[PDB]
Amino acid sequence: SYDRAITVFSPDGHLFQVEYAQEAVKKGSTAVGVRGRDIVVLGVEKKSVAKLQDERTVRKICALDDNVCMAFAGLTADARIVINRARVECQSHRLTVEDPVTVEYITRYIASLKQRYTQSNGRRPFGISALIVGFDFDGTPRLYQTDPSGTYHAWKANAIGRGAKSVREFLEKNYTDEAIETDDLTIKLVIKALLEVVQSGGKNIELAVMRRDQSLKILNPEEIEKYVAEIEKEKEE
Amino acid sequence: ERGYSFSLTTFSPSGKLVQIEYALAAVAGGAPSVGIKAANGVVLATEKKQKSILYDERSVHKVEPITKHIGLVYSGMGPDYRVLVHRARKLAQQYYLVYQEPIPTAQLVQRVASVMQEYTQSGGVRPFGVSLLICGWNEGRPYLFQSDPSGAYFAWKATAMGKNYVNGKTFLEKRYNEDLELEDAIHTAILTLKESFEGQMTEDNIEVGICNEAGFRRLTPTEVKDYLAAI
Amino acid sequence: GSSAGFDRHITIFSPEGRLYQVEYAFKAINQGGLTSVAVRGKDCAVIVTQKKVPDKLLDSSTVTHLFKITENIGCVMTGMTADSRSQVQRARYEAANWKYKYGYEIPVDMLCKRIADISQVYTQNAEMRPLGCCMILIGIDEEQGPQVYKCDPAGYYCGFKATAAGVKQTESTSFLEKKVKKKFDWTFEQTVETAITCLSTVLSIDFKPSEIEVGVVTVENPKFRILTEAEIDAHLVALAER
Amino acid sequence: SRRYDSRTTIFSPEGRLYQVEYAMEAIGHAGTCLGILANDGVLLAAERRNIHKLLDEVFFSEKIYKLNEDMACSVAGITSDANVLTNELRLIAQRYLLQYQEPIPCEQLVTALCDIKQAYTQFGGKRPFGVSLLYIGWDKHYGFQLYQSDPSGNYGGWKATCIGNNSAAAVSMLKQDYKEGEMTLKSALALAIKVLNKTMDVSKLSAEKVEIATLTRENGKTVIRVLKQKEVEQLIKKHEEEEAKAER
Amino acid sequence: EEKVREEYEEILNTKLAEQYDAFVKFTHDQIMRRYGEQPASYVS
Amino acid sequence: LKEREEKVREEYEEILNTKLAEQYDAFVKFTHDQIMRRYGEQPASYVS
Amino acid sequence: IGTGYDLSASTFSPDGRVFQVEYAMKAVENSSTAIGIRCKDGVVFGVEKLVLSKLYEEGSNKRLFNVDRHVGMAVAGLLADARSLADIAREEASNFRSNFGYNIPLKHLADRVAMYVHAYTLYSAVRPFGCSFMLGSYSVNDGAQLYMIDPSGVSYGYWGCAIGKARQAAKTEIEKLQMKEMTCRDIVKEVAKIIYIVHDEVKDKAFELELSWVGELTNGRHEIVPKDIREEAEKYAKESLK
Amino acid sequence: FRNQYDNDVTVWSPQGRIHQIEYAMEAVKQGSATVGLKSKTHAVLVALKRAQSELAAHQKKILHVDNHIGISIAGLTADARLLCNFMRQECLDSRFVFDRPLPVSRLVSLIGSKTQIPTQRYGRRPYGVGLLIAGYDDMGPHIFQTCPSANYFDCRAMSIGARSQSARTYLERHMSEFMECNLNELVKHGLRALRETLPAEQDLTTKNVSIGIVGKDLEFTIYDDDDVSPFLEGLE
Amino acid sequence: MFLTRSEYDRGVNTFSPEGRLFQVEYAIEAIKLGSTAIGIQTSEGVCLAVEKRITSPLMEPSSIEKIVEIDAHIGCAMSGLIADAKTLIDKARVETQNHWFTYNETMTVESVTQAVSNLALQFGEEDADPGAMSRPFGVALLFGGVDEKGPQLFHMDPSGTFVQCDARAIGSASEGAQSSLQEVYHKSMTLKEAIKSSLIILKQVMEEKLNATNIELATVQPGQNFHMFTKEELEEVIKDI
Ligand SMILES: [K+]
């Protein structure tokens, strides 16, 4: 079996393979996630807008479970692998512990898997960064990310992929107690965050929403267009 | 003791497996081998130009039977041909044990090609340096195949491989048609070998094998003498 | 002789299809400094090798290149000595296993093919080097008569009417070819004559009996026998009188 | 040995996998294979690159491989890796059939093969499968489907796509000419012939140089039929008439 | 005696390493020029 | 004894020149084969 | 000569030389010389065991091992590899006695250990042993035997051999002996003489002579030379060295 | 490319040397000084415990191995602990199988073989630790030195670590007395040798010296900060 | 043979000419990039403090845990690549619970630190099993807790060297914090003084301003168990500065 140490410490203490996985993440499509009072919203940029494609097959927001869902930036196939293992682990935890997985538990599992690939023999780190959202059993919304290095943190709102810094600055300047008062305000906040980096509005936005005791809902293009129109009127004033 | 676990064959920046190209170069540098699919058989011919009279021509053979109805010839590195012949015999026997029917020639070609593919991608190994011509008669129809070092198999009606293989292919292209019987195919294969043969070609410096309804068999030197005299 | 990549270090193809490690293994065969000559006749096979004793402190009984594979097959090894001993040990094992599994003694061509397959494995994989030694097996087949076979590091094997391997295999090959083309019905005496004559005319030595080794098999006596100093001296005297 | 290791499964300084990219260049130099999803069927059209007239073409097809009762695929790239991948695809489809006693949904088979390709680009040091496939199928869930796969293990559901030599031009033509949800089997066949005309510029698009197979549904049974020489000739002649009529 | 040979071998190794590094960086420059223009399809 | 040292220096210079030439030949063959594709070159028999 | 083809024992030089094995031999010729001489009734070993610091105890870093009840072992080169090979030889003799039920012939122990060390001259995953060693035994039904094994793995019988820095001088002075007619009681004296001749008192300051014979005098048991006989041998060697 | 003779343990230099072994020897040489002695009835190890900072307790250097044997480490401490665990396991196995203490020389031979194994395999590295092994068995007091080269020495006294040459010089000049010394003046000689390593601005304190003694009727006991005082008093 | 980069010309288990494993030195360099951590072992407890290093206000400090609980009597402050610290924390927890299961007694802090430190150089290549680590852990840990010997503080670096420290500072600002702890430490200083001193040092070394949400402080007293301070409990000591 292959046992070369792909990820090794470089001088100055950098793990180059992890940094390169992060660079691959930086070239992925922008993904934004915002945690509201009673709704959690995930949004992804679609550079692959090409019209000869089945939108169902390139979804970048996947439901890890009935109460957990994630969006990724980076390599698509590695994201598929991590999503599949996360679903398997969710179902295993539900058998063994009787209860639905908390968001932080599956986030820890995904982070541990990425870190293990960072340090195990003969495999490169996962070139994906995630945004694991969902609701806990006690009704507390959550939002985490998992970088390729394996570090996971909780965020009120974050962006991964290209334009992460721009959208992160926008969210810093535009995440207040009022901006997440209602569901529509959260939807519009995520859409406005994406519009800071997407080429054209509406057509390049994939937006999924999760609220209490309801499964993930993929907002259809018509709803995205009507929301974007609402931001257009709001910006006019 | 543990072998390397990484592919020696990898994609070049041009987008091409250079090791397979170099294996094909070794194939193109070997003794010419020709195969002609007649309407009632197929002939496999190659030259046995030993580099001294000291070599015993009957000691080693380049046209090796695999089953009672399949034979093969190569153009490249002899030891790799021996390895692939042994593996093809193993695969044929496994098929016979499973299905109690002689292995179809297409199936044997597919399995040999799978072995070649394995050696193209597996760790610490180099691709085989032989292209095979697998001949067989089954389902009342002659067959002729060519398996390049990469493991890609092509159905052929007539082909030449080795030195002057492009000129031999042009020769065959000019002088092959559907209605050839086995004897005409043998004559044409001998002429194709002659087209690149250097010096006088005799019984012991060419090896010819045929397969028909009666099955596959190497032509004995006396029969090759009879066919050579016909020119 | 183009080169790109590690093709001169591990057994991978050069751009012209050449494996340079195999050719370097042939050079390693040459590195031994000795040459060996084998020739078969009507009812015998003879292997004659160059026996050099660099130091008078060696036990000359323990410096040999003729090895008895089985009770009926002989072997002369040219090249690196440790590799040659590995190959002879492997040949002994394969022959014994053949007898155990199949109930009859291994044919010489079969043993040469097994050793050649092992050599091919060496020249296919990348982590072990080929053995820089060459094997010349002799024996009597029940149906086909005397057998002379040779296997080189490339994995090639073939039967020979008369062959040679070592530092002077080309000159010996030319001489044996000139003698073979005549086809004058070799006997045991004539076979040992032509082997010793080839070795001497190529090396220009005129051996005393202690500078060569002779191993013979015969249809009358299929036992492999390593000729002693008396027999070799008798043959050399026969050379001298002519 | 680290000296001889080619480091196939590592990242580049700029964060890309060189081996996958090189395999994709190899595929981009391979035979053109395009598929079009129609309302009543889905078809695969593949340029044959070996045209030499000493070939026999004994088998069912040379590019189109039947994967199960209800699915088929084409290949652009290395043929031997294609063979191992298509064998693995057949194994996966039959494993679902054994486990669930029903045909495998197309996306599941694509996902399994793509997961294997991901494994080969994730660990082990082995070179990736330089094969991009082009799947056509049908299932009781999403009807007629067309799927693309990449050496990196990526896949996408396409309604019209082309892989191989001159793939970009074919994709542009398909984008211009594909009519959403209004393309029948005959319209798709005509579009395929037209696209292959401007893709095989050098070869002038004879019927001996293309292999077309259609997947339709008849009486609850899926039929995968390779188009005959006569009817491919008819398609080409009809396209020639239409091209001449354009001059009018 | 042997030290002179060792020093000459070290100098030769250093020079060969410099030339080989030049070759490696040149190939890397060509590859980065070649594959930088188009975006990777797999990353998304 | 310095004559042997000068001879060793000359041999080292010749060896360095030969090694540099061989390395350059290897590099140019590498560039011609693995890189620098030709537009008019159809792929080999194994690409289909 | 190298710098591109001397990185692994699994690589052949363009002229067919495995440079790693040659570097192991270079390692073994930079060690203190160990000599062994075979006589009518046994073999006597001798070692110029240098004492690197005087803080060591007399008998530290022995180079005369005892691999079986009737076989000795003199070593030169890296002592870690010498001890590892001593354990390998001990295990081979133990396994031989366990399976075949009698003492291993030294002609077979030498072959087994030589093949073991040859296995390390083929692969890039391992390195050749940096120690050449001698084996010596005496049995009434097989006589006195002396064999040398070097990093390549070649085994030859010797009437007398030397391994280490002063191999050439030791062999030159051993040839002056007539060991074929002498007995152990005199061969030990001459071994001390040879070791003291080949030793240089200006480069390596101090050394202690380590002697051991196996032979008829010891019923086949390989024993360290008794203290009184060692004192007499050193007395003779010093007087001769004048 | 690079020096191509230094990275791998399985690559011989054209001079017949393995540079990785020498680099592990350097690892031993960079460690803090240890010095050990032996009388005809005792074997004493005294080590110079080094402190990372003025607020950090000094590293333990004498480690228990068995009822009747002990070691003093110098080099990589994790390698030292792994080799110490191997030694302890071998001693316990000898006590289990034979119900007798394991002879010191045989234990050192096992250490030599175990440390030689990685000397010859690809990817492996030499044990970058040098061990001063002092034990008492039927053959009297023993002191041993083991190098990363898997070569071990039967010593009468030895010092390994940083500035060890001064301690070795002191030991050499005063070897003749060690045999007839009692425990107190034997450990005084050891402390003098260890002081010879220290620079001019420092001297032995109960903080930076540890003493391990094994003898005829003496459990191997490591003497620590408070307990070193009776041996320390009376040097200078 | 071209395009090979010198990143992998050396193996993982290779020594430098100075006798230091290259990977261990690189992991030590990685330690100097982590958040600063401070620990003081007083006679009435052990205190551990670490900066959170909040990159952006959207990140919740409650999630970024750089101090953890090995058991009721052991804590751990981590600096460096926190992703690598979790394997060691899990191993320490497993060892503590195994020791309780087997012996019915709390495992000594020194024994826990030793058990975790044995993992530090257990990394390699093909020589080992598939589950073997490929690189040293880029984490320095400050184990602190109370046991039979009283309050204990330990420091383990990637080299596997674990050493008992009266007051140790690790992370980016290790040197300045260590000099300050030298200036302030007395063998008879109380836990309240230790906490105040540690927070003062953190304020001196932190780039961000010290507040109740950008540090974590925990104590292990000979009485009560491992305790994580909170808001309304960390302001009560921050205000004094
Ligand atoms: K090889």
UniProtKB/Swiss-Prot annotation, chain D:
Q: Which UniProt keywords apply?
A: Acetylation, Cytoplasm, Host-virus interaction, Nucleus, Phosphoprotein, Proteasome
Q: Which cysteines are joined by disulfide bonds?
A: none
In the UniProt record, which is one GO cellular component term? Answer: nucleoplasm
What inducers act on this gene? Down-regulated by antioxidants BO-653 and probucol.
Q: Which CDD domains match?
A: proteasome_alpha_type_4
A Pfam family this protein belongs to? Proteasome_A_N
Residues with PTM Phosphoserine = 12, 74, 172
Where located? Cytoplasm; Nucleus
Q: Does the keyword Acetylation apply?
A: yes
**Which residues does the record list as N6-acetyllysine (modified residue)?**
126, 175
Extract one GO BP annotation from the record: proteasome-mediated ubiquitin-dependent protein catabolic process
InterPro entries for this protein: Ntn_hydrolases_N, Proteasome_alpha, Proteasome_alpha-type, Proteasome_asu_N, Proteasome_bsu_CS, Proteasome_sua/b
| The protein's role, per its UniProt record | Component of the 20S core proteasome complex involved in the proteolytic degradation of most intracellular proteins. This complex plays numerous essential roles within the cell by associating with different regulatory particles. Associated with two 19S regulatory particles, forms the 26S proteasome and thus participates in the ATP-dependent degradation of ubiquitinated proteins.
What PANTHER family would the database entry show? PROTEASOME SUBUNIT ALPHA/BETA (PTHR11599)
Quaternary structure and partners? The 26S proteasome consists of a 20S proteasome core and two 19S regulatory subunits. The 20S proteasome core is a barrel-shaped complex made of 28 subunits that are arranged in four stacked rings. The two outer rings are each formed by seven alpha subunits, and the two inner rings are formed by seven beta subunits. The proteolytic activity is exerted by three beta-subunits PSMB5, PSMB6 and PSMB7.
Swiss-Prot record, chain E:
Q: How is it modified after translation?
A: Polyubiquitinated. Polyubiquitination is dependent of UBR5 that extends pre-ubiquitinated AKIRIN2.
Regarding tissue, the record states: Widely expressed with the highest expression in peripheral blood leukocytes.
In which domain of life is the source organism classified? Eukaryota
Give the residue interval(s) assigned to the motif SYVS motif. Answer: 41-44
Q: Where in the cell is it found?
A: Nucleus; Cytoplasm; Membrane
Cited function: Molecular adapter that acts as a bridge between a variety of multiprotein complexes, and which is involved in embryonic development, immunity, myogenesis and brain development. Plays a key role in nuclear protein degradation by promoting import of proteasomes into the nucleus: directly binds to fully assembled 20S proteasomes at one end and to nuclear import receptor IPO9 at the other end, bridging them together and mediating the import of pre-assembled proteasome complexes through the nuclear pore.
Q: Which family does it belong to?
A: Belongs to the akirin family.
Q: What else is known?
A: 'Akiraka ni suru' means 'making things clear' in Japanese. The name is given based on the presence of the clear nuclear localization signal.
Quaternary structure (record): Homodimer. Interacts with IPO9; the interaction is direct. Associates (via SYVS motif) with 20S and 26S proteasomes. Interacts with SMARCD1; promoting SWI/SNF complex recruitment. Interacts with NFKBIZ. Interacts with YWHAB.
UniProt protein name? Akirin-2
What organism does this protein naturally occur in?
Homo sapiens (Human)
Gene encoding the protein: AKIRIN2
Swiss-Prot record, chain F:
Quote the PTM field. Polyubiquitinated. Polyubiquitination is dependent of UBR5 that extends pre-ubiquitinated AKIRIN2.
Q: Does the keyword Cytoplasm apply?
A: yes
So which domain of life are we looking at? Eukaryota
* A GO BP annotation: positive regulation of interleukin-6 production
Q: Tissue-wise, where is it found? A: Widely expressed with the highest expression in peripheral blood leukocytes.
KW Transport (keyword) present:
yes
For this UniProt record, give its keywords in alphabetical order, as a comma-separated list.
Adaptive immunity, Cytoplasm, Developmental protein, Immunity, Innate immunity, Membrane, Nucleus, Phosphoprotein, Protein transport, Repressor, Transcription, Transcription regulation, Transport, Ubl conjugation
Name of this chain's protein: Akirin-2
The source organism is Homo sapiens (Human)
Q: What is the lineage of its organism?
A: Eukaryota, Metazoa, Chordata, Craniata, Vertebrata
Which residues of the complete protein does this chain represent?
Answer: 156 to 203 of 203
From Swiss-Prot, chain I:
Under InterPro entries, the record lists: Ntn_hydrolases_N (IPR029055), Proteasome_alpha (IPR050115), Proteasome_alpha-type (IPR023332), Proteasome_alpha_type_5 (IPR033812), Proteasome_asu_N (IPR000426), Proteasome_sua/b (IPR001353)
Q: Known Pfam families for this protein? A: Proteasome (PF00227), Proteasome_A_N (PF10584)
> Which CDD domains does this one have?
proteasome_alpha_type_5
Keyword Transcription applies: no
Which cellular component terms (GO) are annotated to the entry? cytoplasm; cytosol; extracellular exosome; extracellular region; ficolin-1-rich granule lumen; nucleoplasm; nucleus; proteasome complex
Described purpose of this protein according to its UniProt entry: Component of the 20S core proteasome complex involved in the proteolytic degradation of most intracellular proteins. This complex plays numerous essential roles within the cell by associating with different regulatory particles. Associated with two 19S regulatory particles, forms the 26S proteasome and thus participates in the ATP-dependent degradation of ubiquitinated proteins.
Q: PANTHER family in the record, alphabetically?
A: PROTEASOME SUBUNIT ALPHA/BETA
Task: Identify this protein by name.
Answer: Proteasome subunit alpha type-5
Write down the species.
Homo sapiens
